[PDB]
Design a binder for this molecule. Structure first.
Ligand SMILES: NC(=O)c1ccc[n+]([C@@H]2O[C@H](COP(=O)([O-])OP(=O)(O)OC[C@H]3O[C@@H](n4cnc5c(N)ncnc54)[C@H](O)[C@@H]3O)[C@@H](O)[C@H]2O)c1
Ligand SMILES: NC(=O)c1ccc[n+]([C@@H]2O[C@H](COP(=O)([O-])OP(=O)(O)OC[C@H]3O[C@@H](n4cnc5c(N)ncnc54)[C@H](O)[C@@H]3O)[C@@H](O)[C@H]2O)c1
Ligand SMILES: O=c1ccn([C@@H]2O[C@H](COP(=O)(O)OP(=O)(O)O[C@H]3O[C@H](CO)[C@@H](O)[C@H](O)[C@H]3O)[C@@H](O)[C@H]2O)c(=O)[nH]1
Ligand SMILES: O=c1ccn([C@@H]2O[C@H](COP(=O)(O)OP(=O)(O)O[C@H]3O[C@H](CO)[C@@H](O)[C@H](O)[C@H]3O)[C@@H](O)[C@H]2O)c(=O)[nH]1
Ligand SMILES: [Cl-]
Ligand SMILES: [Cl-]
Ligand SMILES: [Cl-]
Ligand SMILES: [Cl-]
Ligand SMILES: [Mg+2]
Lengths: 347, 345
């Protein structure tokens, strides 16, 4: 059978997706450069070594940068891929605005190169990791796929938007390409085993890991970025979606490609928004601990509220986000508790 | 530090700009991969060999591709540049729609690689070849720099808008950078000598060269892409600008970078629009030849009318186009008549 190439497969979403793929009968080939993934004691990234244990299935992996043309070409020559799931890229530690060229090089040129290599090797089926950030500051809610895109605040979001645009044109020009662009909302939670999860390096830039870190006792209090937004409690509102559900949406995307779907774009969210305080409260409930916090200044570029309109995906992808808030918090807690300091090499 | 790097300098606008640079006292270093330039009998592209003869000044040239990181590194180590004028890229031969990846690779990846090397070497002064196509279908006319941009119809135009956006971001992130983004309208004409000019290969996609080719007798008749637009005569209207004035605008941009201006954007147009038929007529006058034409269907994605609001460039850049229609046509004809097969065969 033909393989599925997973770029950035050792990361948060990627590792969860590799797990889903293995369970569903697929044969992935994963690549990662360790830019934001922990190396295990062996060749495999720790996250994937664990996915191998969890599934009882082998993970084919190669350490490689998507920017390395020769390595990528050799890879496409060695295997017969039927599709590519592209997670590799830079996300922001609120860094993008300051290092635009890094985002443009890694995300933009990296993806252009991948598309070129794909085309040359006759692989024209892609699943791309997009984001709700491409919608920019919401002009209305909930955010449906028809909401305007572009006009993003930072280089990270613009990079995502430019990539979407490029893929849309590619599909427009060549009807033989099939591409599913998945606009993720705010992924959270972890695999139910508690063995893998989000493994941030240093001080977490995103909410959830910070909250869990407070709950576990690593951090004293959560810093709440502004409480004067035009939301019910004044704190930011987001559509948190269980990483497992998100991962499963990728399998749905592969099925969609098989229908010779052309270019399709789908939001991957729950359709339900929760504020910062609400997430804190849910974490107190999951963890059985009080979670202190302090209100500080707004974070540059933060939007008031963002949540998806998930109907298109339910309809066309035949997918829905099955896990609720308590599940997300309980799963995140299990991962946090079982792995107080994230991933580590085997003892 | 001292020299000015000119990418794609062997092309139409680039060669004319190289000439202007030389006459103004600058020292250019030109790079080109010959993707759309004719090779002379020697090292230099024919256009540049001619520029050298016309100015009596030497042209420093290096055959290379902007997509080659290794060559860029060597180049930046070899010379000390104070600024870069970036013309290299793929234009559409109405091709963009059908070959997106080529456009994105050359225009996007090539520009990003260039920006990275510039940054690495501390050469944070750029002049970029943008286009009025970034405005998309005009919402109002004339087009001023404040008109909305983006939401372009093609991979080519999209590529231009994406590049502008990247540059804006870069300037935001690093206040030391200076960048002048030049939105050209419809470049036409040629150097007064008649020795250099646009050298299209095959059937021209743009109006003027097609028109001149009909006049010289290379083409039977001009196909007019629709005569039912909401223009005074039903045919498409454009702001034709003489390539010599356009080239001079680049020198004004260079001076602007010296002010430590950050990111600035200017239209490079005359502010006067002319229809397909007006251009044909003016060409008949200039050439003394008849230019038969046939009205055909509208061309995919064509806009009815597009022309610039040249105020900002006059005010801030201190520049205005001086040459008019008759001069553009006179110069275009001279080039075509004197060089029936372009630079060579
Ligand atoms: N986490 C979110 O909330 C979120 C929301 C929006 C969209 N996304 C996108 O989904 C994707 C996955 O996000 P994530 O949370 O799992 O991030 P992550 O950082 O954990 O995963 C990305 C993986 O890519 C790898 N990588 C980075 N640069 C690479 C390169 N040049 N070559 C090869 N591998 C490289 C990293 O080492 C990492 O393992 C990213 O493209 C991200 O932009 C994530
Ligand atoms: N002519 C127009 O109507 C028009 C309109 C607006 C903007 N522009 C832009 O202005 C610039 C110059 O246009 P032009 O009419 O002179 O076109 P041109 O094709 O004559 O000049 C571009 C030059 O770049 C060179 N080149 C292409 N790819 C290269 C690469 N990878 N590395 C090095 N050199 C490379 C080509 O060989 C050519 O000599 C381009 O960026 C074009 O998109 C032109
Ligand atoms: O220490 C923190 C972190 C976050 N927040 C707030 O919590 C909310 C969520 O913030 P964060 O987790 O950083 O999420 P977002 O900025 O919404 O971005 C996440 O989700 C986006 C999709 O909506 C993706 O594009 C991003 O990559 C991803 O990190 C916002 O209201 C933040 O202001 C705090 O108050 N304190
Ligand atoms: O054989 C031809 C060629 C052109 N036209 C018409 O002539 C006009 C000019 O056409 P063309 O020379 O192809 O220019 P544009 O369609 O305006 O596109 C140009 O103008 C933009 C700025 O306005 C630049 O950015 C582009 O790169 C440049 O190709 C239009 O109304 C065309 O419909 C014809 O009728 N027949
Ligand atoms: Cl291992
Ligand atoms: Cl020579
Ligand atoms: Cl030098
Ligand atoms: Cl292509
Ligand atoms: Mg719906």
């Amino acid at each position: 059978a033909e393989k599925v190439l997973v770029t950035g497969g050792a990361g948060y979403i990627g590792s969860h997706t590799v797990l889903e793929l293995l369970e569903a009968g697929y044969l992935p080939v994963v690549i990662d450069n360790f830019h934001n993934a922990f190396r295990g004691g062996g060749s495999l990234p720790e996250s994937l070594r664990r996915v191998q244990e969890l599934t009882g299935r082998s993970v084919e992996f190669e350490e490689m940068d998507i920017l390395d043309q020769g390595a990528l070409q050799r890879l496409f020559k060695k295997y017969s891929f039927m599709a590519v799931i592209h997670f590799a890229g830079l996300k922001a530690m609120g860094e993008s605005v300051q290092k635009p060229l890094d985002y443009y090089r890694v995300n933009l040129t990296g993806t252009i190169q991948l598309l070129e290599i794909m085309k040359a090797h006759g692989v024209k089926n892609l699943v791309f990791s997009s984001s709700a950030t491409v919608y920019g500051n919401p002009q209305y809610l909930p955010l449906d796929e028809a909401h305007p895109t572009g006009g993003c605040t930072n280089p990270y979001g613009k990079s995502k938007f430019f990539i979407e645009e490029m893929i849309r044109d590619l599909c427009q020009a060549d009807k033989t390409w099939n591409v599913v662009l998945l606009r993720y909302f705010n992924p959270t939670g972890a695999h139910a085993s508690g063995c893998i999860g989000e493994d941030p390096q240093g001080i977490p830039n995103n909410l959830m890991p910070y909250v869990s870190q407070v709950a576990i006792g690593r951090r004293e209090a959560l810093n709440v970025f502004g409480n004067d937004y035009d939301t019910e409690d004044g704190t930011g509102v987001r559509d948190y979606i269980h990483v497992v559900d998100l991962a499963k949406g990728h399998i749905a995307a592969l099925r969609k490609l098989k229908e010779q779907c052309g270019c399709r774009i789908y939001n991957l969210g729950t359709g339900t928004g929760y504020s910062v305080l609400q997430m804190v409260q849910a974490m107190e409930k999951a963890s059985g601990k009080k979670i202190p916090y302090k209100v500080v200044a707004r974070r540059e570029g933060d939007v008031a509220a963002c949540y998806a309109n998930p109907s298109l995906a339910q309809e066309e992808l035949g997918w829905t986000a099955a896990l609720g808030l308590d599940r997300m918090c309980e799963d995140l807690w299990r991962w946090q508790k079982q792995n107080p300091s994230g991933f580590g090499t085997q003892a």
